[model samples]
Target: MDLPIMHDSDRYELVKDIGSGNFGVARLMRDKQSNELVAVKYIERGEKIDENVKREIINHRSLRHPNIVRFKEVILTPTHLAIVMEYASGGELFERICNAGRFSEDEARFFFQQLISGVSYCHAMQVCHRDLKLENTLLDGSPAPRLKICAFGYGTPAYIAPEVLLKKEYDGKVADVWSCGVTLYVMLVGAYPFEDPEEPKNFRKTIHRILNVQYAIPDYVHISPECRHLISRIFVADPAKRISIPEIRNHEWFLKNLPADLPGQSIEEIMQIIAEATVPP
Candidate 1:
């Protein structure tokens, strides 16, 4: 048995580290052959490369959509593995929201539409992002700034569902809707729906509120009625009764001349692509 040969120097010129976290270091790199900027995420090969690493690779590699981060290639080596993806020039949506405060209904609606479109497509392919947050959403500087979801590192407690909080087996699709609702709230008000408190007791209080699916738009925040209705549908505690992707897309707030029909590549077809990509030559 032999591992395939790989050398980052031969293919890409590592520019600098763009992002880093517990997961791995993502470097801004220039593809030597293509002369294009791409993000190369370097994850140290842990005990047999880890399941989350495989999931991230397989999930991004299989997805092809306008609103999702484009997966370029994956490099496997003995010491480090690399996942290459399209670099979002404008950076994370979180940064934008922080600098600009909350977005107007029209502005937020645009990004929201893109976010749900990508999520809906993932669900149609039987894949759930399980993480839908402002930081995961990236922007391309296309004048209007198109948003793409990136960094599929599961999710955080702030956006996680009540069922997941109780350590119950939950449907990923349903859970994603709750996260999206939180995301929508953030976009409209620039604050978390369920506040992440600093003190342990306060944190517990916040968790209790989330468990009860209790949230409210502050009186100061001025969002549209349609937006409020959509949020109400998504933030439901019961997964069985939660608003689905179809319903969200069809909601009046979400239906602003957006495409009615969305087609997804079959899961079998997607998995075949993943298999081919993962296999050693």
Candidate 2:
């Protein structure tokens, strides 16, 4: 697909400020030509824009799948780099969880299956979605709420893999397997698997528990054995011993009622365009 390097501010009209976070400030904007609403994530042009920004754009642009949010085009403003992308009207999957106590197995599976499908597609593209959290996952405006992944990067505090914590070299792909486990735990158990319940906000305690791989599901939470087993395989501190994305695809729990949208339908004008989008005015 051909993407333009041009930055025509006239073409996009900012609707409002929707959100902001470590990635950048996000805004709701509409394209003048199509009147299509898109979310534009803007990071200022400064020391904060590191190689990760370039890698985020390059790696994200290389992917094509249903569950992954569609990458529109990158526009460079004099002071910011705006990465335009598909806007999920339903907002963060994390938003839903806050109101509920854990979800039913069937409900959790609905979200989980799509996650594995998108992640499987990501890995296939040689892109390790190091970031995997309900917050990073999103929901499209559908009757059943289709799950679409946004925020192409990050290894959150609670979701960080053990090997990643060591600060030594680690496989991004293998590291992500652990995150998928944390994500699974959240859906079924409604809690951070690595956090100390008595002192949930303690970062040190959480990290220690993560390093020691010490966490357990509460008995009251009724999760299916097959899904629980899959989580076990992913929690391995040793990356070499972790359950891979492919293996996750083959897992019985992952396949049950898997949505039809998992299969990806269909890149090199991308890199050249990324190089163009890398700089600013």
Candidate 3:
């Protein structure tokens, strides 16, 4: 309820489009007051409004942590719903991995730890991230970038767990651990763990691979035993047997060179706004 509800023209001007998805387009904006750049997601006003938009706003608004992206305000124009948030100049971690091929074990761990910290924060209160992937996490502009879990939001089947593939009623909290490890594997190994390179487009082949816990880290990659051991614990197919986030936090690899110090509300009155926003414009 305390979120800044503002008009689009009052304090910001659109620069250009930066990105998009089924929801709509993301634009860069120049803040009139500070002249600082901010990223804005503009969803066209129409039947598109639903519980999904409300859930995302509530989820985005309630979170405040170093690893999770910063939320600025909500701008309502007659034409759309614009969510203003921090501009991560470094963009997607996915692109970084794409360019570099992969990371050294230490480099992989660096980003992994930040992701764990941010995700740990997310699970603590935001509840659970039903969808998590490398693309969802962003980095601030810096030599040693600060990672932020931004999507709260997807372009791959690589990170999904067996339970989700089977369409079983899965717990996102448990499934999230599996996806996190997939990302870790992608970083350290330079490829998707369960995906065989021969037929990357073979959908059933991928699902069976994940179901059987099938994957390999090439000997050439040089992953240490402890790090390899941790990935083993995370990649389990049985959700009941998989290691939880708390366990990952305490792993020996996570402790070495650990950087110290990494670290909402209201009901009835707000329901009206949501209801109003729900209807066609």
Q: Estimate each model's TM-score.
A: 0.78, 0.79, 0.85
Count: clashes, candidate 3: 0
Ranking by lDDT: 3, 2, 1
Off by over 4 Å in 2: 1-13, 19-23, 32-35, 43-55, 76-81, 129-135, 151-156, 260-281
Cα RMSD (angstroms) for every candidate in the order listed: 5.3, 5.2, 4.5
- What is the model-wide C-alpha lDDT for candidate 3? 0.74
Q: Residues 1-281, candidate 3, lDDT per residue (tens digit)? A: 12123346667886766445322346677889887777776566667767777777766767788787766676555666666787777877877887898898888999999988887887888467563443357788778898977655415577888877785587888788888898898888878888887788887888888989999899789888999999999988888899998998899988878888851234343444556655556
Ranked by TM-score from best down, the candidates are: 3, 2, 1
Q: Highest lDDT, which number?
A: 3
Task: Give one digit per residue, the lDDT tens place, for model 1 in 1-281.
Answer: 12223357877887766445422446777889888777766555555355566676676677788887777776655555556787777777777887888888888887888888888887887777454343357787577798877646423356777876775578988888888887778888887777653443466767878888777787888877888888888888888899998888778889875655534335565454444444433
Each model's lDDT comes to 0.71, 0.72, 0.74
Residue 219's C-alpha lDDT in candidate 1? Answer: 89
Deviation (Å) of 233 in candidate 3: 0.4
